Design a protein around this nucleic acid. Structure first.
Lengths: 143, 26
DNA sequence: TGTATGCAAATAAGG
DNA sequence: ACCTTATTTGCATAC
């Protein structure tokens, strides 16, 4: 049950949002900080870029547009008018040790994940997810 | 062979708009 | 300098 | 709890 009119609404709003962002003097990175400080909806420059270029899914774009439009209408209306975990950086040295563990055994037990996280001074959950994503990558690249 | 290593948005609004434009002109 | 994007961390949803 | 498949999302960096 696809709606052509919804795609048009998104195309139009994408074009006019970029237009009006620029006219207000905001970079893509500026929009993303304004939405965090003001509304709690922190968003990266990457995500604003994808939204303006329509390079998000239809569902993701639909969910962001009202959050973007609210920001824009406020920023243009000045006549006296919980949060995602930060993306953990994994340095090349750590990645290489995890890769070696993965080649040894691509599915460490929970006890083994604990040992690894302690060895590398990491949180158990980050190591757990690293192995999940690495197993997924192995399926993706050998499809 | 250069294989894409990471995850991608499989179907974008951009592509859906091109695809509606392919079906209308039909 | 801003913007676009490769790689992947983090999250969503089911079993 | 914690894997799976699925998808959102942002570092880091190339233009």
């Amino acid at each position: 049950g696809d709606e052509p009119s919804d795609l048009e609404e998104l195309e139009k709003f994408a074009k006019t949002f970029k237009q009006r962002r620029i006219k207000l003097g905001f970079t893509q990175g500026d929009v993303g900080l304004a939405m965090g400080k003001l509304y709690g909806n922190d968003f990266s420059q990457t995500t604003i870029s994808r939204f303006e270029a329509l390079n998000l899914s239809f569902k993701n774009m639909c969910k962001l547009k009202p959050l973007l439009e609210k920001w824009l209408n406020d920023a243009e209306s000045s006549p006296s008018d919980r949060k995602r975990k930060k993306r953990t950086s994994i340095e090349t040295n750590i990645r290489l040790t995890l890769e070696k563990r993965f080649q040894d055994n691509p599915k460490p037990s929970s006890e083994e994940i604990s040992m690894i996280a302690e060895q590398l001074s990491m949180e158990k959950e980050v190591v757990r997810v690293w192995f999940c994503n690495r197993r997924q990558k192995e399926k993706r690249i050998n499809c | 062979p250069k294989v894409y290593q990471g995850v991608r948005v499989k179907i974008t609004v951009k592509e859906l708009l091109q695809q509606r434009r392919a079906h209308q002109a039909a």
